[PDB]
């Protein structure tokens, strides 16, 4: 056993894996989004600095979990980071974006509970401090993306995304 | 009654007191284990700086709880700090500290237990950004000296302690 | 077809599509390294901090990797990124280390060979601006490293192993 | 001979006279478009100005392959600079740009072809280091360019001409 280890059932040690991999998931989507739009049939260079910016973000999350696992004394396990899933237009990766935050959250609020069935304070303050508003903030900034590129007209009209990549994300 | 008392239980008052008292134990350990490194017999003054830095971090810890109870509208009672219970070398001391710290969170545990048990969510909260995340820390950082002493060669191997003296604590 | 491509063979694009995937690869290795040594059983933190920093050059060179297939008029296709394969001691990890960059190495030779058969000078000055020489000097290092952590005594000196995180890795 | 001539055929002299040609004529080409932006019926200065950018950029390469041939011994033969070959748009001049950018690495390639047949390694890296990376820099730009003009709805559309000029081109 760890010697630093306290309050930490295996079963959050095994939540705070998947949670890893998930992170590193989301950091390889936002990385293939990026280039889609560094492609010269696409060439949007600020929708692909802003998803490579959102892709660093990721991987610092996913770092601070592993972090978190040592910090406890568990052990890190790591798995295969899956291909993305699936980019369209600027609007569609805005969409994408948003279900994969969506999707992020909603693992963070199952290891929450987990946390808080299992009586574990820290690791309840670690999600919360580090992650829930993160993700709500996130998410809230991508619905707000997505409603302009409609409202502009998008993906239909390109002048929409191309003043959208200049003005909202320039 | 307080005329600022507000939600805060009388075992959640006498807890904190009771966590102010561990507190101040802890800081008359850390400053016995001090003095110790500071004899000419023992001559480690980075061992001796380092915890006497410990002594007063939890001086201040103690002093945060005092804040607190006032600021609850509880009644501070102070009982006796006993003496250290027992500090061999520098890899005993490192082992004797990460045994504290691991009493000092489980006693912090159950205080947050008590306050989710009294629906307090403002103790919840001071436990949390004030206390468990330094107590985790704490611990690993212990962890750490533990598992560098135990490699060098110590407590038998005097170099292994001074270089860690030197490099690590310096 | 691309409106940009010009001398660029499917050949080529399939080989940079492949390198990118090796280069995503040695940056999860080295990210799993980084995070043992960040294990309170093992605690050098500068064995960490040079394998982090080694992580995120690999990821640098699978996105100059990706810049390089658009810039060419070639289509990114990505891979899953495989768990690292097996890290016991601080030299076993610098030999790990040693044998991927050989690896790796290797992988850039073979993609200058596919691009010299294909008269693609452009990829060919590419290879050897940004990659060979990179690989020849982290290849020197790790070496070198290996070589002194071996004549220090590790991996049975844990010693030996404190001391090189402190002067050569601090 | 020149006493300084050294591994440098004729054949490599006379194509390297040719390509001082194309940068002159390339340079020429970009002075047309510039000043055909500069119309009083066109009126699209950052267009004037970015083609006028290009043009010196033009004449610069073309005084380094004159440097080269002096550097290797070679005779400067110069020809007439013929007049541009054909605006109608910003996006058919951008177009007509991508041509001519794509014929001049054409060119390169043919030259870094014969370099490598006459087994000149210095103009091998000469081409090289100052040419090839830059014509695939200049094709990625203006393929970029071509494609936001078509989706902005160029050249029906002089709102898309306006807007790119101010916010690509300004
Ligand atoms: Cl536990
Ligand atoms: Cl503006
Ligand atoms: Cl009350
Ligand atoms: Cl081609
Ligand atoms: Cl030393
Ligand atoms: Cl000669
Ligand atoms: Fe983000
Ligand atoms: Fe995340
Ligand atoms: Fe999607
Ligand atoms: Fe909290
Ligand atoms: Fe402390
Ligand atoms: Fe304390
Ligand atoms: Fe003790
Ligand atoms: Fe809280
Ligand atoms: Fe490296
Ligand atoms: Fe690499
Ligand atoms: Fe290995
Ligand atoms: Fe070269
Ligand atoms: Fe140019
Ligand atoms: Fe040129
Ligand atoms: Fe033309
Ligand atoms: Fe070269
Ligand atoms: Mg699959
Ligand atoms: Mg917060
Ligand atoms: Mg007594
Ligand atoms: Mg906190
Ligand atoms: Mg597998
Ligand atoms: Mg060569
Ligand atoms: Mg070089
Ligand atoms: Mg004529
Ligand atoms: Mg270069």
Same mark, same amino acid.
């Given at each position: 056993?760890?010697?630093?280890?306290?309050?930490?059932?295996?079963? +959050?040690?095994?939540?705070?894996?998947?949670?890893?991999?998930?992170? #590193? %998931? @989301?950091? !390889?989507?936002?990385? *293939?989004? +990026?280039? %889609?739009?560094?492609?010269?049939?696409?060439? #949007?260079?600020?929708?692909?600095? !802003?998803?490579?910016?959102?892709?660093?973000?990721?991987?610092?999350?996913? &770092?601070?979990?592993?972090?978190?696992?040592?910090?406890?004394?568990?052990?890190?396990?790591?798995?295969?980071? =899956?291909?993305?899933?699936?980019?369209? *237009?600027?609007?569609?990766?805005?969409?994408?974006?948003?279900?994969? &935050?969506?999707?992020?959250?909603? +693992?963070? #609020?199952?290891?929450? =509970?987990?946390?808080?069935? =299992?009586?574990?304070?820290?690791?309840?303050?670690?999600?919360?401090?580090?992650? #829930?508003?993160?993700?709500?903030?996130?998410?809230?900034?991508?619905?707000?993306?997505?409603?302009?590129?409609?409202?502009?007209?998008?993906?239909?009209?390109?002048? @929409?995304? !191309?003043?959208?990549?200049?003005?909202?994300?320039?």
């Amino acid at each position: 056993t760890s010697q630093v280890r306290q309050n930490y059932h295996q079963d +959050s040690e095994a939540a705070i894996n998947r949670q890893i991999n998930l992170e #590193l %998931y @989301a950091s !390889y989507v936002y990385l *293939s989004m +990026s280039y %889609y739009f560094d492609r010269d049939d696409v060439a #949007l260079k600020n929708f692909a600095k !802003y998803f490579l910016h959102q892709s660093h973000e990721e991987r610092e999350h996913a &770092e601070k979990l592993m972090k978190l696992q040592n910090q406890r004394g568990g052990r890190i396990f790591l798995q295969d980071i =899956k291909k993305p899933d699936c980019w369209e *237009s600027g609007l569609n990766a805005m969409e994408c974006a948003l279900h994969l &935050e969506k999707n992020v959250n909603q +693992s963070l #609020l199952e290891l929450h =509970k987990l946390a808080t069935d =299992k009586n574990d304070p820290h690791l309840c303050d670690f999600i919360e401090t580090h992650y #829930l508003n993160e993700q709500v903030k996130a998410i809230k900034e991508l619905g707000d993306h997505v409603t302009n590129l409609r409202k502009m007209g998008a993906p239909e009209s390109g002048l @929409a995304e !191309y003043l959208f990549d200049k003005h909202t994300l320039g």
